[PDB]
Design a protein around this ligand. Structure first.
Ligand SMILES: O=c1ccn([C@@H]2O[C@H](COP(=O)(O)OP(=O)(O)O)[C@@H](O)[C@H]2O)c(=O)[nH]1
Ligand SMILES: [Mn+2]
Length: 342
């Protein structure tokens, strides 16, 4: 299947780093055409993209005008521009070029060696399972000490849309475009009105890493969290593996049985590495305060978007802690996310 890589660029010449890695690992130019959509009009960045010649297709967002923002958004013009560019670029991919799907890659992302293999293998899953709405290369809790380096092939389902290197079908763009927001597109997709209970596939070890310390957003989130996500460097032949375990029917039975069948341990014992014979445990939280307290105690991202925790699935956040597999989970009576958990 032909799956274009849509690279979103603007005014950072470091799009070079992004393109160099994509082109180095690309297994087929025919199967993975690279389309670089550039906003802003920055000359140096345009020259960098143009220098790749026919290895990429360079297109330019046509409307470089300033955008009238709402009264609460004077400091956020950049986010309005990002949203406008996404709408135009995705429109080019799905309306002009008429591709069936696309992997969206921001210009400050470096991909892993098996980035293409991963999407080639998971595309069929996304096509077949309507309960999935994306495949993402990003593990929100993918810091080196929180992932199992011996399981680079392990994948999961997540209710938290990760973005940062993600595959979507033309069918999803059909649903999103008519109501595309003025700004903050990713948090908008995280709302239940958009997500509609759908999940994304995400890996144990991230297939992308960001180097965009300087960008539209102030660098604090990058400095405290994003910079620490470990990029996978061990090539996994995903197309040769049986990924049927990711189908909702199998996953919701097996993964959930696994989580709730695991012994429960108090957060303090997990933290101080007590009871090491229990290689897989569950740390149960019962409310917003305990979730944030326990997440923080174990070094897990503790913010919530529309009530969904980072990398969470049915409220469960799975990660490694000092070599132990941990599932920070709600009681099994869990029955939906509460957006008021902020
Ligand atoms: O006016 C702009 C500013 C940025 N971007 C793009 O939108 C993405 C997000 O930008 P950035 O990485 O700077 O955002 P941050 O991660 O800092 O929130 C990148 O692909 C940029 O090239 C854009 O299309 N138009
Ligand atoms: Mn960025």
């Amino acid at each position: 299947a032909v799956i274009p890589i849509l690279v979103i660029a603007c005014d950072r010449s470091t799009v070079r780093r992004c393109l160099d890695k994509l082109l180095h690992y690309r297994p087929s130019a025919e199967l993975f055409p690279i389309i670089v959509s550039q906003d802003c009009g920055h000359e140096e960045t345009a020259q960098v993209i143009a220098s790749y010649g026919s290895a990429v297709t360079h297109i330019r967002q046509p409307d470089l005008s300033n955008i009238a923002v709402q009264p609460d958004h004077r400091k956020f013009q950049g986010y309005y521009k990002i949203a406008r560019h996404y709408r135009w670029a995705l429109g080019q991919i799905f309306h002009n070029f008429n591709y069936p799907a696309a992997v969206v890659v921001e210009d400050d992302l470096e991909v892993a060696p098996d980035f293409f293999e991963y999407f080639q293998a998971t595309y069929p899953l996304l096509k077949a399972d309507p309960s999935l709405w994306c495949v993402s290369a990003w593990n929100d809790n993918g810091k080196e000490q929180m992932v199992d380096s011996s399981k680079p092939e392990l994948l999961y389902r997540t209710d938290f849309f990760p973005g940062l290197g993600w595959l979507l079908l033309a069918e999803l763009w059909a649903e999103l475009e008519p109501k595309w927001p003025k700004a903050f597109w990713d948090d908008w997709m995280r709302r239940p009105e958009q997500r509609k209970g759908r999940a994304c596939v995400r890996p144990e070890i991230s297939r992308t890493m960001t180097f965009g310390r300087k960008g539209v957003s102030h660098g604090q989130f990058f400095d405290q969290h994003l910079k620490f996500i470990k990029l996978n460097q061990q090539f996994v032949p995903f197309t040769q593996l049986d990924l049927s375990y990711l189908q909702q029917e199998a996953y919701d039975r097996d993964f959930l049985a696994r989580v709730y069948g695991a012994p429960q341990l108090q957060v303090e014992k997990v933290r101080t590495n007590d009871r090491k014979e229990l290689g897989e445990v569950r740390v149960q939280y019962t409310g917003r305060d305990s979730f944030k307290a326990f997440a923080k105690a174990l070094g897990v991202m503790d913010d919530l978007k529309s009530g969904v925790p980072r990398a969470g699935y049915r409220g469960i956040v799975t990660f490694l802690f000092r070599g132990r597999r941990v599932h920070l989970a709600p009681p099994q009576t869990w029955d939906g996310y509460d957006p008021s958990w902020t």
